[PDB]
Design an enzyme around this catalytic site. Structure first.
Site, PDB file in Angstrom:
ATOM      1  N   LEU A   1      54.590  33.860  79.692  1.00  0.00           N
ATOM      2  CA  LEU A   1      53.493  34.526  79.014  1.00  0.00           C
ATOM      3  C   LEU A   1      52.497  33.560  79.121  1.00  0.00           C
ATOM      4  CD1 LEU A   1      51.985  36.286  77.474  1.00  0.00           C
ATOM      5  CD2 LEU A   1      52.939  35.296  75.232  1.00  0.00           C
TER       6      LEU A   1
ATOM      7  N   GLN B   1      56.542  46.519  73.464  1.00  0.00           N
ATOM      8  CA  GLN B   1      55.123  45.984  73.772  1.00  0.00           C
ATOM      9  C   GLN B   1      55.086  45.418  75.013  1.00  0.00           C
ATOM     10  OE1 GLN B   1      52.814  42.766  71.492  1.00  0.00           O
ATOM     11  NE2 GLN B   1      51.722  44.507  70.826  1.00  0.00           N
TER      12      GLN B   1
ATOM     13  N   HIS C   1      52.977  43.055  76.913  1.00  0.00           N
ATOM     14  CA  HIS C   1      51.717  42.162  76.856  1.00  0.00           C
ATOM     15  C   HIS C   1      51.072  42.145  78.030  1.00  0.00           C
ATOM     16  CE1 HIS C   1      50.582  38.219  74.731  1.00  0.00           C
ATOM     17  NE2 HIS C   1      49.927  38.363  75.903  1.00  0.00           N
TER      18      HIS C   1
ATOM     19  N   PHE D   1      41.349  37.107  68.315  1.00  0.00           N
ATOM     20  CA  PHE D   1      42.449  37.581  69.040  1.00  0.00           C
ATOM     21  C   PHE D   1      42.358  39.352  69.156  1.00  0.00           C
ATOM     22  CE2 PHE D   1      45.670  34.582  70.160  1.00  0.00           C
ATOM     23  CZ  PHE D   1      46.846  35.270  70.453  1.00  0.00           C
TER      24      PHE D   1
ATOM     25  N   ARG E   1      52.281  46.033  67.777  1.00  0.00           N
ATOM     26  CA  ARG E   1      52.181  44.662  67.544  1.00  0.00           C
ATOM     27  C   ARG E   1      50.678  44.188  67.626  1.00  0.00           C
ATOM     28  NH1 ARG E   1      53.090  40.468  70.144  1.00  0.00           N
ATOM     29  NH2 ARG E   1      52.550  38.259  69.633  1.00  0.00           N
TER      30      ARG E   1
ATOM     31  N   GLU F   1      47.024  35.379  74.843  1.00  0.00           N
ATOM     32  CA  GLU F   1      45.926  36.209  74.642  1.00  0.00           C
ATOM     33  C   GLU F   1      44.988  35.296  73.829  1.00  0.00           C
ATOM     34  OE1 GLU F   1      46.154  40.552  73.250  1.00  0.00           O
ATOM     35  OE2 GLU F   1      45.758  39.963  71.242  1.00  0.00           O
TER      36      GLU F   1
ATOM     37  N   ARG G   1      47.162  45.469  72.635  1.00  0.00           N
ATOM     38  CA  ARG G   1      48.079  45.400  73.446  1.00  0.00           C
ATOM     39  C   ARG G   1      48.307  46.631  74.402  1.00  0.00           C
ATOM     40  NH1 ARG G   1      48.569  39.766  72.992  1.00  0.00           N
ATOM     41  NH2 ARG G   1      50.208  39.324  71.095  1.00  0.00           N
TER      42      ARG G   1
ATOM     43  N   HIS H   1      57.513  42.083  76.001  1.00  0.00           N
ATOM     44  CA  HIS H   1      56.884  40.792  75.110  1.00  0.00           C
ATOM     45  C   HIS H   1      57.602  40.824  73.793  1.00  0.00           C
ATOM     46  CE1 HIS H   1      54.491  37.675  73.526  1.00  0.00           C
ATOM     47  NE2 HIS H   1      54.126  38.467  72.743  1.00  0.00           N
TER      48      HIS H   1
ATOM     49  N   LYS I   1      73.315  30.819  67.013  1.00  0.00           N
ATOM     50  CA  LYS I   1      74.016  30.662  68.132  1.00  0.00           C
ATOM     51  C   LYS I   1      73.403  29.697  69.296  1.00  0.00           C
ATOM     52  CE  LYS I   1      71.638  34.198  71.294  1.00  0.00           C
ATOM     53  NZ  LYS I   1      71.611  35.395  71.918  1.00  0.00           N
TER      54      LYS I   1
HETATM   55  C1  LIG Z   1      56.163  34.022  75.034  1.00  0.00           C
HETATM   56  C2  LIG Z   1      55.692  34.492  73.515  1.00  0.00           C
HETATM   57  C3  LIG Z   1      54.754  34.019  73.043  1.00  0.00           C
HETATM   58  C4  LIG Z   1      54.488  34.658  71.607  1.00  0.00           C
HETATM   59  N1  LIG Z   1      53.415  34.302  71.023  1.00  0.00           N
HETATM   60  C5  LIG Z   1      53.294  34.596  69.605  1.00  0.00           C
HETATM   61  C6  LIG Z   1      51.936  34.233  68.799  1.00  0.00           C
HETATM   62  O1  LIG Z   1      51.218  33.597  69.695  1.00  0.00           O
HETATM   63  N2  LIG Z   1      51.902  34.754  67.823  1.00  0.00           N
HETATM   64  C7  LIG Z   1      52.712  35.780  67.233  1.00  0.00           C
HETATM   65  O2  LIG Z   1      52.438  36.150  65.987  1.00  0.00           O
HETATM   66  N3  LIG Z   1      54.034  36.215  67.823  1.00  0.00           N
HETATM   67  C8  LIG Z   1      54.324  35.468  68.882  1.00  0.00           C
HETATM   68  N4  LIG Z   1      55.381  35.923  69.720  1.00  0.00           N
HETATM   69  C9  LIG Z   1      56.266  36.857  68.964  1.00  0.00           C
HETATM   70  C10 LIG Z   1      57.077  35.939  68.306  1.00  0.00           C
HETATM   71  O3  LIG Z   1      57.518  34.766  68.893  1.00  0.00           O
HETATM   72  C11 LIG Z   1      58.700  36.407  67.821  1.00  0.00           C
HETATM   73  O4  LIG Z   1      58.323  37.946  67.262  1.00  0.00           O
HETATM   74  C12 LIG Z   1      59.277  35.718  67.100  1.00  0.00           C
HETATM   75  O5  LIG Z   1      59.347  34.324  67.794  1.00  0.00           O
HETATM   76  C13 LIG Z   1      60.541  36.302  66.478  1.00  0.00           C
HETATM   77  O6  LIG Z   1      61.028  35.193  65.620  1.00  0.00           O
HETATM   78  P1  LIG Z   1      62.714  35.526  64.916  1.00  0.00           P
HETATM   79  O7  LIG Z   1      62.779  34.286  64.060  1.00  0.00           O
HETATM   80  O8  LIG Z   1      62.569  36.965  64.398  1.00  0.00           O
HETATM   81  O9  LIG Z   1      63.479  35.516  66.391  1.00  0.00           O
HETATM   82  P2  LIG Z   1      63.507  34.275  67.327  1.00  0.00           P
HETATM   83  O10 LIG Z   1      62.525  33.370  67.066  1.00  0.00           O
HETATM   84  O11 LIG Z   1      63.760  34.675  68.863  1.00  0.00           O
HETATM   85  O12 LIG Z   1      65.086  33.629  66.914  1.00  0.00           O
HETATM   86  C14 LIG Z   1      66.166  34.235  66.997  1.00  0.00           C
HETATM   87  C15 LIG Z   1      67.360  33.539  66.313  1.00  0.00           C
HETATM   88  O13 LIG Z   1      68.599  34.219  66.112  1.00  0.00           O
HETATM   89  C16 LIG Z   1      69.665  33.587  66.635  1.00  0.00           C
HETATM   90  N5  LIG Z   1      70.384  34.808  67.057  1.00  0.00           N
HETATM   91  C17 LIG Z   1      70.501  35.474  68.268  1.00  0.00           C
HETATM   92  N6  LIG Z   1      71.738  35.989  68.496  1.00  0.00           N
HETATM   93  C18 LIG Z   1      72.574  35.478  67.652  1.00  0.00           C
HETATM   94  C19 LIG Z   1      73.940  35.743  67.554  1.00  0.00           C
HETATM   95  N7  LIG Z   1      74.586  36.691  68.119  1.00  0.00           N
HETATM   96  N8  LIG Z   1      74.777  34.976  66.450  1.00  0.00           N
HETATM   97  C20 LIG Z   1      73.899  34.049  65.765  1.00  0.00           C
HETATM   98  N9  LIG Z   1      72.751  33.873  65.895  1.00  0.00           N
HETATM   99  C21 LIG Z   1      71.883  34.526  66.805  1.00  0.00           C
HETATM  100  C22 LIG Z   1      68.952  32.537  67.605  1.00  0.00           C
HETATM  101  O14 LIG Z   1      69.800  31.538  67.921  1.00  0.00           O
HETATM  102  C23 LIG Z   1      67.699  32.275  67.012  1.00  0.00           C
HETATM  103  O15 LIG Z   1      68.016  31.021  66.109  1.00  0.00           O
HETATM  104  C24 LIG Z   1      55.565  35.626  70.991  1.00  0.00           C
HETATM  105  C25 LIG Z   1      56.626  35.881  71.836  1.00  0.00           C
HETATM  106  C26 LIG Z   1      56.727  35.320  73.034  1.00  0.00           C
HETATM  107  C27 LIG Z   1      58.109  35.748  73.696  1.00  0.00           C
END
Ligand SMILES: Cc1cc2nc3c(=O)[nH]c(=O)nc-3n(C[C@H](O)[C@H](O)[C@H](O)COP(=O)(O)OP(=O)(O)OC[C@H]3O[C@@H](n4cnc5c(N)ncnc54)[C@H](O)[C@@H]3O)c2cc1C
Ligand code: HEM
Ligand SMILES: CC(C)(C)c1ccc(CNC(=O)c2ccccc2C(F)(F)F)cc1
Ligand code: SF4
Ligand code: F3S
Ligand code: FES
Lengths: 138, 102, 239, 613
Positions: free
Chosen positions: D255, D243, D245, D122, D400, D258, D289, D356, D41
């Protein structure tokens, strides 16, 4: 879908659409840099325009340079009005020259921070006025 | 990898520094030699100069080629007209000098 | 109370006989976060639920909400609203981009150019890949600081007059800085053919050091600076 | 109907998501020669992994020397033994290989004296299975490791014929007789509808942090994948486990990593005390956490907060070398300024436990395949996978461990691909689809587009969020939770009463943020009920009325002549939530955590034990 193909689709799609274009010159902030490159173009264009007329009239017009100066002389010339004309010649010559140097420093990779641009940009204006007023009274 | 566009760039800068170096060297040493190279540097530089403006604003093939030519004529005419003036008249250096005394 | 006025560009493709107009909104700043996006959101949710705009991170690190706020291209989630009320914050979309609707400009071309440079590590022998970590000295790594962070917000490339007049054939800073980023990544082996790809009037050489690009970048990055650097590689690299 | 044209596409695989999990899955499929679509999306880069800062854990032994099994142990401890130990083995072993792969992809990791990837400390990590002190395996790109991760992958992604549907909002799954046939989706631009059908499907949509009023998560973290599964009548897992954070700006919620604590940062309360040492002595606030945020959030309850209303804790950095803050933490250095007006080199940050990560999700194998629960047994939904924050293999379980979720993405994204590659072949019969398939999602679409009720989407969302903030906070109790439940249930009723204003086809964010709300409720519903039924303090789930950790044995005592509890009498099991769409009524069963590993000789099933860092 390749990079080329994407680009192709963009244009086909958008040209044959009814989407507007976002504005640009009308909304965008006026920067000293902006103005200072515009001028550098303008000045450029005026100088070449100037050089052209000079070399062209050499081939097209009658007489010789002396005759054309003696023509000028006999125009109840004001000494201020002469200075004016003479400043008008050399103002854009010097602007473009000094700024041209700044361009050439940049091409040496040098001095491209928003500080340095405002500094050098300002210097160019100062060097311009001074060399212009200078030359126009030599 | 014909460095054809990048050599064009380098040349532009090269002539620009010449033309920087000529303005004052001419003042210091007015002579036929200088009057021509002044003619050379001026016209060439201004040709590539305008070149850019054109390739920046003139869109579509036919039109650009057309302007590009009509530019080249102007540039050719200009170099000639100057060389002529150097040969059959006062010459740039001195022409300015006289013009200045005025 | 404290009303601040927002004058915002609008366009609906699903309302025949509509054409680009502005609309004003008024916001009690006591009940609103400091950043401009906070406003655009607050007006979406409370006032007008038509207003259409892009957003995600609200943290200035993703590039979704790039737009022209008061004549300068930045992220609305990072520009804090002008607390002074005599002034009326004007908001437009990014300049000279085909507007899909309201503040939502079409970037597909922008991205496609990003595609056209091959933004990834390239090696002559990729037979030993995905097994050992490639070595890179901290000094070799430092050359990327200032380059690797590029959000792809696209505020820069869409502030460059050369890119206004030549979106089709000129690549624009965003992308070129990244082309450069790969050039000086020690790990990469295709630094030359990367440079070879730019041997034409437009790709690279529609830059005329206007320097608007670096000016407006949301991350204090210096593309212009990187363009220059490119041009120097372009003239002095051999083959 | 017939206001909408439906455009059918055919494919060998659909990956819903373009975040590291989505990307990695997406192209790993293509790489394996599968005609693969990717529905996202948002523009891939815009996804959340970008936002991530800390790093990605993997025992490369770059700082010290290391063993992935020590990583396993740390992870499974972290999970508070709700984490399924086969999937944790798979990951922690794989983590080296997966990280190295990202570096050979181009990701610019920070470097060392040796010119290898810079790893760092970490929260919750150790050596020699907890004995040998602190561990340093969080590989990082200074402070922007998610950003790099994402753009590296995205970049790589372009080197293949993967077909990216950018700015396409997936609506529902194309299920048919228990089998997934792809996804139906909105095309945000023209508004048309597209039935992308395929032999397999991968759901990689990330979290639902927007169920709350305060979260580090982005505006687009709407639990869309999770919700789509729900509306298939399929279970979601452990969604109650959320979680909080410890850190994250008091105001905006942004955020602060950590990595701040891992680089030697300290937490201070209003009387100056280095307060986290009083709670956990050995971690001293590099702890898990769940525990750290508990310490923080409890210290404000007393009335000992540090602000104009005394409601947040201080995160200190200024005692760390200025040069260190620049090299290791520039990203956070800058946003600390921007949002708080705070210099990091000579002022502490204002932080608050805030939502978080969702270690809940869609249930899965260690092979990425989505699970249902029939006859109190596991059963693989054919042609449907998941990975990252969307899924729940519960590699994280109840908590986590930091810098593992970016690893989660890469590891399991990769696995989903490998797992389809090995099971079926490109070109194989792409299963058929009944002509009226998924009409109900289109009618749902139409309904919400012209939806003319009394409440605005924005206002309902707000209420859902503040509700979940009050009742599903760090601490929660039956009384509160009970209220909270029927509260979320009534808001699900209020879905009839919602005014939508915008009525266009092109880029109607009003309708899609509305859709996003359906998805966010479904998620909220299952989160809060699940929580209220769970009567123990495991990991992030802490009941004040049941503060005991409730296992099959009292593991405090040596076991042996102990009488084991029957499955339905202890809480060491996965919460499996469903909800009947219409009533918005939550039903929920349970299924056992997996303790066996993939090979006992290589990695030891770490049995349950006492919980404290
Ligand atoms: C501020 C922050 C810092 C973080 N730092 C760390 C870190 O240092 N180390 C670590 O291991 N983890 C970290 N995390 C956790 C980690 O970032 C997330 O768990 C991870 O980004 C999730 O990846 P993902 O691809 O599963 O989802 P996301 O990266 O959130 O991506 C989701 C995807 O799905 C798509 N999507 C959503 N809804 C729809 C729909 N209806 N139709 C089609 N597509 C859709 C979106 O467009 C997007 O492309 C952090 C999280 C946050 C919020
Ligand atoms: C010492 C004298 C001069 C120097 C150092 C100089 C330098 C330059 C440089 C560096 C540029 C390119 C700007 C860029 O990087 O994009 C330029 C452009 C130009 N110059 Fe000059 N110049 C000089 C004198 C002149 C003269 C005498 C004329 C005309 C008679 C002239 C006409 C132009 C024109 C037409 C352009 C193109 C303008 C543009 O593309 O923006 N210049 N000059
Ligand atoms: C106000 C007016 C003088 C009409 C004006 C405003 C703004 C512009 C934009 N600038 C330009 O067109 C410009 C200016 C200097 C150098 C190069 C360019 C380029 F071709 F590359 F764009 C050009 C002209
Ligand atoms: S360079 Fe600065 S501006 Fe151009 S895109 Fe990357 S970030 Fe946005
Ligand atoms: S704004 Fe434009 S022309 Fe060149 S240096 Fe900057 S790109
Ligand atoms: S919305 Fe993410 S950059 Fe502002």
């Amino acid at each position: 879908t390749t990079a080329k193909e994407e680009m192709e689709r963009f244009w086909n799609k958008n040209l044959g659409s009814n989407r507007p274009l976002s504005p640009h010159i009308t909304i965008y902030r006026w920067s000293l840099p902006m103005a200072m490159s515009i001028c550098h173009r303008g000045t450029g264009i005026a100088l070449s325009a100037g050089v052209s007329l000079f070399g062209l009239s050499a081939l097209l017009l009658p007489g010789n340079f002396e005759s054309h100066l003696e023509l000028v002389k006999s125009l109840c010339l004001g000494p201020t009005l002469i200075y004016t004309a003479k400043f008008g010649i050399v103002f854009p010559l010097m602007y473009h020259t000094w700024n041209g140097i700044r361009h050439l420093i940049w091409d040496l990779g040098k001095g491209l921070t928003i500080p340095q641009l405002t500094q050098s940009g300002v210097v160019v204006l100062i060097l311009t006025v001074l060399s212009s007023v200078g030359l126009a009274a030599m | 990898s014909s460095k054809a566009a990048s050599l064009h760039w380098t040349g532009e800068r090269v002539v620009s520094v010449l033309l920087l170096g000529l303005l004052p060297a001419a003042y210091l040493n007015p002579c036929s030699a200088m009057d021509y190279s002044l003619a050379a540097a001026l016209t060439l530089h201004g040709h590539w100069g305008i070149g850019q403006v054109v390739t920046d604003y003139v869109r579509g093939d036919a039109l650009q080629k057309v302007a590009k030519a009509g530019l080249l004529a102007l540039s050719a005419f200009t170099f000639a007209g100057l060389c002529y003036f150097n040969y059959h008249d006062v010459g740039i250096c001195k022409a300015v000098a006289m013009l200045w005394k005025l | 109370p404290r009303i601040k006025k927002f004058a915002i560009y609008r366009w609906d493709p699903d309302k025949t006989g509509d054409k680009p107009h502005m609309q004003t909104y008024e916001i009690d700043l006591n009940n609103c976060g400091p950043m401009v996006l906070d406003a655009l959101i607050k007006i979406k949710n409370e006032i007008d639920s038509t207003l259409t705009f892009r957003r995600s991170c609200r943290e200035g690190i993703c590039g979704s909400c790039a737009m022209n706020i008061n004549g300068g291209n930045t992220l609305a989630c990072t520009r804090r609203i002008d607390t002074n009320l005599d002034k009326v914050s004007k908001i437009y979309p990014l300049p000279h981009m085909y507007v899909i609707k309201d503040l939502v400009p079409d970037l597909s071309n922008f991205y496609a150019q990003y595609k056209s440079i091959e933004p990834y590590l390239k090696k002559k022998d990729e037979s030993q890949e995905g097994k050992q970590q490639y070595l890179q000295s901290i000094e070799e790594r430092e050359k990327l600081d200032g380059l690797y962070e590029c959000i792809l917000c696209a505020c820069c490339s869409t502030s460059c007059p050369s890119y206004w007049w030549n979106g089709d054939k000129y690549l624009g800073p965003a992308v070129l800085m990244q082309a450069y980023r790969w050039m000086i990544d020690s790990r990469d082996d295709f630094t030359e053919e990367r440079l070879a790809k730019l041997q034409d009037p437009f790709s690279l050489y529609r830059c005329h050091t206007i320097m608007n690009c670096t000016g407006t970048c949301p991350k204090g990055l210096n593309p212009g600076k990187a363009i220059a650097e490119i041009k120097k590689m372009m003239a002095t690299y051999k083959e | 109907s017939t206001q909408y044209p439906v455009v059918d596409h055919e494919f060998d695989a659909v990956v819903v998501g373009a975040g590291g999990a989505g990307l990695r899955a997406a192209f790993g499929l293509s790489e394996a020669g599968f005609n693969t679509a990717c529905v996202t999306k948002l523009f891939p880069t815009r996804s959340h992994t970008v936002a991530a800062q800390g790093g990605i854990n993997a025992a490369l032994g770059n700082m010290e020397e290391d063993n992935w099994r020590w990583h396993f142990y740390d992870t499974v401890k972290g999970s508070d033994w709700l984490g399924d130990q086969d999937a944790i083995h798979y990951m922690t072993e794989q983590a080296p290989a997966s990280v190295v792969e990202l570096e050979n992809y181009g990701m610019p990791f920070s470097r060392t004296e040796d010119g290898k990837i810079y790893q760092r400390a970490f929260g919750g990590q150790s050596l020699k299975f907890g004995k040998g002190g602190q561990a340093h395996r969080c590989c990082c790109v200074a402070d922007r490791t998610g950003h790099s991760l994402l753009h590296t992958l995205y970049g790589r992604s372009l080197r293949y014929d993967t077909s990216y549907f950018v700015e396409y909002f997936a609506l529902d799954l194309l299920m048919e007789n228990g089998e997934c046939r792809g996804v139906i989706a909105l095309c945000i631009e023209d508004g048309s509808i597209h039935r992308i059908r395929a032999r397999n499907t991968v759901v990689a949509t990330g979290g639902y942090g927007r169920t709350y009023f305060s979260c580090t998560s982005a505006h687009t973290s709407t639990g869309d994948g999770t919700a789509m599964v729900t509306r298939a009548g399929l279970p979601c897992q452990d969604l109650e486990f959320v979680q909080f954070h410890p850190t994250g700006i008091y105001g905006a919620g942004c955020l602060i990593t950590e990595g701040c604590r891992g680089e030697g940062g300290i937490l201070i309360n209003s009387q100056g005390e280095r307060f986290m040492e009083r709670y956990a002595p050995v971690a001293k606030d590099l702890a898990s956490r769940d525990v750290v945020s508990r310490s923080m959030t409890l210290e404000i309850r007393e009335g000992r907060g540090c602000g104009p209303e005394k409601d947040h804790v201080y995160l200190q950095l200024h005692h760390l070398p200025p040069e260190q803050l620049a090299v290791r933490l520039p990203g956070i250095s800058e946003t600390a300024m921007i949002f708080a007006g705070v210099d990091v080199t000579k002022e502490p940050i204002p932080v608050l436990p805030t939502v978080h990560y969702n270690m809940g999700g869609i249930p899965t194998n260690y092979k990425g395949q989505v699970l249902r629960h029939v006859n109190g047994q596991d059963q693989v939904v054919p042609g449907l996978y998941a990975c990252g924050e969307a899924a729940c293999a519960s590699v994280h379980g109840a908590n986590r461990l930091g810098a593992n979720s970016l690893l989660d993405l890469v590891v399991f994204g990769r696995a989903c691909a490998l797992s389809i590659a090995e099971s079926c072949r490109p070109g194989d019969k792409v299963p058929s689809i009944k002509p009226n398939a998924g009409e109900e999602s289109v009618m749902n679409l139409d309904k919400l587009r012209f939806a003319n009720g009394t409440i605005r989407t924005s206002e309902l969302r707000l209420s859902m969020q503040k509700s979940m903030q009050s009742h599903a906070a760090v601490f929660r109790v039956g009384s509160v939770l009970q209220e909270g439940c029927e509260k979320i249930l009534r808001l699900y009723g209020d879905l009839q009463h919602l005014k939508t204003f915008d009525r266009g086809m092109v880029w109607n964010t009003d309708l899609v943020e509305t859709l996003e709300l359906q998805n966010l409720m479904l998620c909220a519903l299952q989160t809060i009920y699940g929580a209220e039924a769970r009567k123990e303090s495991r990991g992030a789930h802490a009941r004040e009325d049941f503060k005991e950790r409730v296992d099959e044995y009292d593991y405090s005592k040596p076991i042996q002549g102990q009488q084991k509890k029957p499955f339905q009498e202890h809480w060491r099991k996965h919460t499996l939530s469903y909800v009947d769409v219409k009533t918005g009524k939550v039903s929920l069963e349970y299924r056992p955590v997996i303790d066996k590993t993939l090979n006992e000789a290589d990695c030891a099933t770490v049995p349950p034990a006492i919980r404290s860092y």
